[PDB]
Design a protein around this nucleic acid. Structure first.
Lengths: 48, 108, 63, 176, 135, 120
RNA sequence: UCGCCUCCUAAAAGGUAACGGAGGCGCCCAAAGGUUCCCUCAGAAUGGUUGGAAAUCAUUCGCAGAGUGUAAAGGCACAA
RNA sequence: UGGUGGCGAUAGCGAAGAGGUCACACCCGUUCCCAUACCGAACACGGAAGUUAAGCUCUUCAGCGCCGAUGGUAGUCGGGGGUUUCCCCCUGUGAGAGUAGGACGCCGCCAA
RNA sequence: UCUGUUCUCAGUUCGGAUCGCAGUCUGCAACUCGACUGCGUGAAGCUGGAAUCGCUAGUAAUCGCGGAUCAGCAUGCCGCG
């Protein structure tokens, strides 16, 4: 059953991103590599 | 192994040879008496020359599939002869003649 | 030819009960043979033992 | 190697001059040998694949390939997933080594073998054997081996018609 | 009683008829045929009644050679209902017949008995009708 | 007569597959390779008119290589097509493999183009 | 029955009604996305095991009968 | 003769026959590059004993498949009638395998 | 029953029934329908639910041995240790 996830950036703390994920298929905390407009580079993004 | 099928390993030869098809205790006794194995032998200790000569003497005797095909040939011969006794084998009833009502229970 | 997942084989030799030698590659190095092709009478032209076993009861009562 | 030289030297020129082929190199030749398990116990016992991974690695010097059921069959209780069977293919000199091991030890070690029928072809010249036991050589761990099941062998040649394949396998030494 | 054993859609439009038949303009399989001149609907019961008329008068023949099969279903609402609220239930099947359509073919029966059989069965159909022989 | 698929049919299939997204235009031509088992061929093709600006092959009458199809000979014929570009300067081209995978004599040809400075 | 998608009615552009004729949706996918590289299915015939019309294989025919996450229509094997 | 493009298969699928000294491709061996969940079957690496049967190119056929007009009809824009769930006549337009036939190839550029 | 070797807990060297081959005896004749032997084949059966039977100074249980009808045929019956 899919749920909404906001993705806070690793070092700065600005989310800027939402996604859908299945907690049955991915019970872990997801790690992406996404552009952060405050940090001006692609940075690792944490599932909150 | 001997007739293409395996052998027990840790028992005497005069008993172990009875495992393979179509050969028996008295026959194994009378062949191994002239073979000279003293009727107590493990197969883990033997010689290749005595293994070869028992291989050819059990090769000459009627052991492996030939007894099966022989009795099959006689019994199918009895089927196309018919002649009552073949009907008894086809029906599964006892053949040598007995009281077919009381026990009759080894067959069918 | 991916190394480490194929089992190794050596140049093995094949020894028969009649002393026949033959060559192959296998896991072992030398292999016993109980019965071989030229020892089995079925390969060697006509059969030798089942030729003697191939008789039938031709109504032989006369003795 | 040895069967390559033997194959050339006393199979090729005799039959090509016997049947008057227009070119030498259109002689028929055995191309490959493919081995099939087809073992359907994975619904009952799913762990029996590595079972005879060990002795097909004993047969051939390279690992077998697990086959894949292309669809799901309910009556056989076969869902999609849980792959069935195991295949391997032999070519080069390993196929000739397999023919040496098949002729020399295996068919005499089969204790009920009689002359196979002439009509054992698939209709084009490609032959299939079925061998019902694992008994090829006595180091197969027959004493504590688990299963007594069979084996499918398909030898595949480039002979277009059946007669060329039949005479080729008689020159190889298959008893009919 | 002629029935298509399966149909895609059991309700379909009534359709319009105009112009001659696309095929079946000539008697080809028997030797005497019968032709429609006016276009209308012909039902299962009309086909069956004509076949019983032909077969029971001739009492003999090669075969009867019906040349049309009803595929169109027609629908009816139940009686005395306010009109609307959805299309009605399928009631029966209809073979659409255009002019120049051979309906029935006859082989192996002689002149006057064939004429009498075809007149006797063409009286059982709602459409104007003409005899024809094979060229 | 078991059916062996021909090399050239599969090569034309994958060559059409790689051709489907690139074609040498005017001032942006296409460098095409043939890797036949005795000789190596390279061409510069303009698509819109079907002309060949320059070409090079190992079966040429001077500065021949003895191995005739080694990757060293591929670097040599890359040098020759580089001088063919040196008379007819374009100085840029889009590489087109034949579906021949970018490991072999095609890789030595491309590396010869890079070493001579032919911009891919 | 009330919102959204697909076909016909829809009259060879688009649009078009009815308590007209058929279905479906209120999701799923951390790969069932993106890129680079490599092929080809469905079905049928024949040979061989407990192998059985039909597990798995090998060969022949096979322009699309099969796939394309799910309803349908339009497209696709120079792959979608 | 090879490489390489365009033209709707008038280019195809087949039935026959030749060719290889140059090329193309069969073949040979996996020593390292590489690779097949199995492999030198493919992908690669580097050679050239012999081999045109296949791939390839030429000569032939209407077998299959493909392309395909003139009048002929069905349909119909626009008029006009009739016993009008549909017919008939006009100045126009005009269908589709079916037949006339075409066809088992036409044009480029580099290396012989 | 008493002394030696083996088997070492198994469908086994248990158990012996069905089945094929070859025989011996009796009898005019062993298929319907006799007994016995040499082989080979080796089955179910791993001490048995509801219930149920016999047994008090050689008694139960086992082990054999005779005999009777009868050319031949016992696990039946009678008797003996």
């Amino acid at each position: 059953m899919r749920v909404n996830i906001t993705l806070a950036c690793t070092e700065c703390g600005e989310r800027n991103y939402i996604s859908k994920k299945n907690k049955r298929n991915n019970p872990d905390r997801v790690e992406f590599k996404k552009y952060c407009p405050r940090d001006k580079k692609s940075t690792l993004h944490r599932e909150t | 192994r001997i007739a293409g099928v395996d052998i027990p390993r840790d028992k005497r030869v005069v008993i172990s040879l009875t495992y393979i098809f179509g050969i028996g205790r008295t026959t194994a006794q009378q062949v191994l008496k002239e073979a000279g194995v003293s009727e107590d032998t493990r197969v883990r200790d033997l010689t290749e020359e005595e293994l070869g000569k028992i291989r050819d003497i059990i090769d000459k005797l009627k052991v492996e599939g030939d007894l099966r095909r022989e009795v099959s040939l006689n019994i199918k011969r009895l089927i196309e002869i018919g002649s009552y006794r073949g009907i008894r084998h086809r029906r599964g009833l006892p053949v040598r003649g007995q009281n077919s009502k009381n026990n009759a229970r080894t067959r069918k | 030819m991916k190394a480490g997942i194929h089992p190794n084989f050596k140049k093995a030799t094949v020894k028969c009960a009649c002393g026949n030698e033959f060559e192959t590659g296998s896991v072992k190095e030398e292999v016993r043979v109980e019965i071989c092709s030229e020892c089995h009478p079925f390969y060697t032209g006509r059969q030798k033992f089942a030729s003697a076993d191939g008789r039938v009861d031709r109504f032989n009562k006369k003795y | 190697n040895r069967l390559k030289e033997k194959y050339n030297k006393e199979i090729a020129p005799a039959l090509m001059t016997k049947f008057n082929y227009d070119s030498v190199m259109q002689v028929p030749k055995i191309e490959k040998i493919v081995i099939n398990m087809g073992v359907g116990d994975a619904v009952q016992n799913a762990k029996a694949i590595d079972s005879a991974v060990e002795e097909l690695t004993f047969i051939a010097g390279q690992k077998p390939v697990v086959t894949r059921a292309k669809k799901s069959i309910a009556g056989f209780r076969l869902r999609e997933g849980m792959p069935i069977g195991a295949k391997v293919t032999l070519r080069g000199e390993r196929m000739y080594d397999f023919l040496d091991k098949l002729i020399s030890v295996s068919l005499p070690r089969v204790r009920d073998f009689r002359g196979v029928s002439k009509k054992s072809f698939d209709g084009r010249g490609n032959y299939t054997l079925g061998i019902k036991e694992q008994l090829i050589f006595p180091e197969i761990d027959y004493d504590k081996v688990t299963k007594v099941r069979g084996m499918d062998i398909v030898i595949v040649t480039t002979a277009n018609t059946d007669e060329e394949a039949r005479e080729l396998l008689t020159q190889v030494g298959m008893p009919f | 009683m002629l029935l298509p054993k399966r149909v895609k859609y059991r309700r379909e439009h009534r359709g319009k008829m105009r112009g001659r038949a696309k095929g079946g303009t000539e008697v080809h399989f028997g030797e005497f045929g019968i032709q429609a001149l006016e276009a209308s609907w012909i039902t299962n019961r009309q086909i069956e009644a004509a076949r019983i008329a032909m077969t029971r008068y001739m009492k003999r023949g090669g075969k009867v050679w019906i040349k049309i099969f009803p595929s169109k279903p027609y629908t009816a609402k139940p009686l005395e209902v306010r009109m609307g609220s959805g299309k009605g239930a399928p009631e029966g099947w209809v073979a659409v017949v255009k002019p120049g359509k051979v309906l029935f073919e006859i082989s192996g029966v002689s002149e006057e008995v064939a004429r009498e059989a075809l007149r006797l069965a063409s009286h059982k159909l709602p459409i104007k009708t003409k005899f024809v022989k094979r060229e | 007569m078991i059916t062996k698929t021909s090399k050239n049919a599969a090569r034309l299939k994958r060559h059409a597959r790689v051709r489907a997204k690139l074609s040498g235009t005017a001032e942006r031509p296409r460098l095409n390779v043939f890797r036949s088992n005795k000789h190596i061929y390279a061409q510069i093709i303009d698509d819109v008119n079907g002309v060949t600006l320059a070409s090079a092959s190992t079966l040429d009458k001077d500065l021949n290589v003895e191995s005739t199809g080694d990757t060293s000979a591929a670097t040599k014929v890359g040098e020759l097509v580089a001088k063919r570009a040196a008379e007819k300067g374009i100085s840029d081209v889009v590489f087109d493999r034949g579906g021949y995978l970018y490991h072999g004599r095609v890789k030595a040809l491309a590396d010869a183009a890079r070493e001579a400075g032919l911009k891919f």
